[PDB]
């Protein structure tokens, strides 16, 4: 007979999972498992981002069991529970989607040397990029792209993606009865205050397939502003209702399907003549996400500088009393406080926003190195994915993809065009809710008897700023200059 185990790492959803469908077809049994480790957070991780991740497993544990199956959370690492459930459970077949990341190669590369010694079949689909990206490195004479024009020259040359995989039948092939690695004590799914955590999450973006695709209907109820969407002419500000789809915390744990996603976009876009094009399109925004994954998985030490090929080599400096301002927000910015306390509460801010703090931090004021910036992005993101989080950081702090180092953006300009009243800022600082908008961006400037009418001193109850923007701003300019002649 056989018996199959589909492994859950991303790809956390039942549609577009050819992962799924394989493990299904002519199968007794069906063993649905996300492997776990206790001893994480005895090692970081926000309580926001890995509650997503519960709440993603308990969609699936309600989606499997809607079907008369199953899903197993088992604990320990996989080196230690496969071979054990390969022989106990009869297994023949296991399946899981393709993963390009580091640690993932290394995992797999494992896990796939012990299924072969237990005679087990692997099975790894390609379903978390839209193409393969191996595929694409070999169709471009072997090397991948490193500009987005030319990226997107390519995928046109390669045409559509694959489409979305047919949904899983609608009775799964249930886990064996009394199979003791499979006891329901011992495979649940646990809350977040069992793994360790302290204080509760504060985000608004709840995880699971099911709010995934509700909030993907939601963005294609208007089809002319899918069809007009232009990333760079989008509000930061907006947060009471995002301007952006915040579809990104859902593709990074494979909730959504890019290829479902990318369906969808081609369905609106011929209707719509006038629709935007890349860069800028909405399907421009899976293609950068794509473009990185395709530069990140053929380059090596991707995430740091140091034996980067595509990294300039800059001499960032060792400010612990900088990046502390920054990462506690307390810069003395209330546009960039703010955003540094959107990060902590809820894990996601506006691309735009995400500019504002990295440009900041790293070659426009602070000259923090790039890597310090990505660990707190590491830390409290919600979407925080390993090479969209590296490229990201290194096009913002001018070491690839992006060079020019004299735009620099105002910490006091940049919110005021979208928001001038600072509607944003006394969301996240409500300490600054009573200050006049004249001075909401640069409340030192405010007359003292404005600051104690308000009931917001600088110095007592919000900080003074840590530096001059106009001398920062300069200084940082001259030593990136110098760094882009001695790179040669
Ligand atoms: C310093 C910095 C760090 C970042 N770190 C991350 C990260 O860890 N995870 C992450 O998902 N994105 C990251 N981004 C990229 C981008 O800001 C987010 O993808 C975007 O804010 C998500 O919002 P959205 O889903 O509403 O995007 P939309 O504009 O609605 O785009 C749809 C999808 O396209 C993809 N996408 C959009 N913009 C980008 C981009 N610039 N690069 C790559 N893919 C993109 C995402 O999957 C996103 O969900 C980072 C950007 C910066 C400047
Ligand atoms: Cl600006």
Same mark, same amino acid.
């Given at each position: 007979?056989?018996?199959?185990?589909?492994?859950?790492?991303?790809?956390?959803?039942?549609?577009?999972?050819?992962?799924?469908?394989?493990?299904?077809?002519?199968?007794?049994?069906?063993?649905?498992?996300?492997?776990?480790?206790?001893?994480?957070?005895?090692?970081?991780?926000?309580?926001?981002?890995?509650?997503?991740?519960?709440?993603?497993?308990?969609?699936?544990?309600?989606?499997?069991?809607?079907?008369?199956?199953?899903?197993?959370?088992?604990?320990?690492?996989?080196?230690?529970? +496969?071979?054990?459930? +390969?022989?106990?459970?009869?297994?023949?077949?296991?399946?899981?989607?393709?993963?390009?990341?580091?640690?993932?190669?290394? $995992?797999?590369?494992?896990?796939?040397?012990?299924?072969?010694? &237990?005679?087990?079949?692997?099975?790894?689909?390609?379903?978390?990029?839209?193409?393969?990206?191996?595929?694409?490195?070999?169709?471009?004479?072997? *090397?991948? =792209?490193?500009?987005?024009?030319?990226?997107?020259?390519?995928?046109?040359?390669?045409?559509?993606?694959?489409?979305?995989?047919?949904? =899983?039948?609608?009775?799964? %092939?249930?886990?064996?009865?009394?199979?003791?690695?499979?006891?329901?004590?011992?495979?649940?799914? !646990?809350?977040?205050?069992?793994?360790? +955590?302290?204080? =509760?999450?504060?985000?608004?973006?709840?995880?699971?397939?099911?709010?995934?695709?509700?909030?993907?209907?939601?963005?294609?109820?208007?089809?002319?502003?899918?069809?007009?969407?232009?990333?760079?002419?989008?509000?930061?500000?907006?947060?009471?209702? !995002?301007?952006?789809?915040?579809?990104?915390?859902?593709?990074?744990?494979?909730?959504?399907?890019? $290829?479902?996603?990318?369906?969808?976009?081609?369905?609106?876009?011929?209707?719509?003549? *006038?629709?935007?094009?890349?860069?800028?399109?909405?399907?421009?925004?899976?293609?950068?996400?794509?473009?990185?994954?395709?530069?990140?998985?053929?380059?090596?030490?991707?995430?740091?500088?140091?034996?980067?090929?595509?990294?300039?080599?800059?001499?960032?400096?060792?400010?612990?009393?900088?990046?502390?301002?920054?990462?506690?927000?307390?810069?003395?910015?209330?546009?960039?406080?703010?955003?540094?306390?959107?990060?902590?509460?809820?894990?996601?801010?506006?691309?735009?926003?995400?500019?504002?703090?990295?440009?900041?931090?790293?070659?426009?004021?602070?000259?923090?190195?790039?890597? $310090?910036?990505?660990?707190?992005?590491?830390?409290?993101?919600?979407?925080?994915?390993?090479?969209?989080?590296?490229?990201?950081?290194?096009?913002?702090?001018?070491?690839?993809?992006?060079?020019?180092?004299?735009?620099?953006?105002? %910490?006091?300009?940049?919110?005021?065009?979208?928001?001038?009243?600072?509607?944003?800022? $006394?969301?996240?600082?409500?300490?600054?809710?009573?200050? %006049?908008?004249?001075?909401?961006?640069?409340?030192?400037?405010? !007359?003292?008897?404005?600051?104690?009418? &308000?009931?917001?001193?600088?110095?007592?109850?919000?900080?003074?700023?840590?530096?001059?923007?106009?001398?920062?701003?300069?200084?940082?300019?001259?030593?990136? &200059?110098?760094?882009?002649?001695?790179?040669?």
């Amino acid at each position: 007979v056989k018996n199959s185990i589909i492994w859950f790492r991303k790809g956390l959803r039942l549609h577009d999972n050819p992962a799924l469908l394989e493990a299904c077809k002519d199968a007794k049994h069906v063993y649905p498992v996300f492997v776990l480790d206790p001893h994480f957070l005895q090692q970081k991780v926000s309580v926001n981002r890995y509650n997503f991740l519960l709440e993603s497993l308990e969609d699936l544990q309600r989606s499997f069991q809607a079907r008369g199956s199953r899903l197993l959370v088992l604990r320990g690492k996989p080196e230690e529970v +496969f071979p054990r459930v +390969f022989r106990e459970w009869g297994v023949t077949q296991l399946c899981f989607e393709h993963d390009t990341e580091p640690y993932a190669k290394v $995992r797999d590369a494992a896990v796939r040397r012990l299924a072969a010694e &237990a005679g087990v079949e692997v099975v790894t689909p390609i379903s978390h990029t839209l193409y393969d990206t191996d595929m694409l490195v070999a169709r471009n004479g072997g *090397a991948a =792209p490193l500009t987005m024009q030319s990226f997107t020259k390519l995928v046109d040359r390669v045409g559509d993606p694959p489409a979305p995989a047919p949904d =899983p039948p609608a009775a799964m %092939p249930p886990p064996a009865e009394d199979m003791p690695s499979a006891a329901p004590a011992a495979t649940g799914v !646990p809350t977040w205050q069992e793994v360790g +955590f302290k204080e =509760p999450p504060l985000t608004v973006f709840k995880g699971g397939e099911t709010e995934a695709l509700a909030r993907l209907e939601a963005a294609f109820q208007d089809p002319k502003w899918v069809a007009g969407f232009q990333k760079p002419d989008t509000d930061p500000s907006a947060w009471e209702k !995002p301007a952006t789809t915040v579809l990104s915390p859902y593709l990074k744990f494979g909730c959504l399907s890019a $290829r479902l996603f990318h369906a969808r976009l081609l369905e609106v876009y011929r209707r719509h003549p *006038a629709h935007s094009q890349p860069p800028v399109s909405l399907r421009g925004q899976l293609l950068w996400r794509e473009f990185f994954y395709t530069v990140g998985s053929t380059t090596p030490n991707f995430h740091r500088m140091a034996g980067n090929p595509v990294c300039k080599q800059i001499d960032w400096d060792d400010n612990p009393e900088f990046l502390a301002a920054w990462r506690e927000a307390r810069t003395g910015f209330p546009w960039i406080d703010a955003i540094m306390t959107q990060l902590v509460t809820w894990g996601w801010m506006h691309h735009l926003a995400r500019h504002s703090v990295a440009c900041f931090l790293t070659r426009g004021d602070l000259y923090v190195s790039w890597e $310090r910036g990505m660990e707190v992005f590491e830390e409290h993101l919600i979407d925080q994915d390993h090479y969209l989080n590296a490229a990201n950081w290194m096009w913002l702090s001018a070491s690839a993809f992006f060079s020019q180092y004299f735009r620099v953006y105002s %910490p006091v300009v940049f919110g005021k065009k979208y928001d001038p009243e600072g509607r944003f800022i $006394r969301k996240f600082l409500p300490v600054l809710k009573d200050m %006049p908008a004249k001075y909401i961006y640069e409340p030192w400037t405010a !007359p003292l008897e404005v600051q104690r009418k &308000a009931g917001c001193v600088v110095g007592r109850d919000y900080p003074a700023p840590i530096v001059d923007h106009a001398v920062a701003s300069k200084a940082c300019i001259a030593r990136m &200059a110098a760094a882009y002649r001695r790179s040669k």
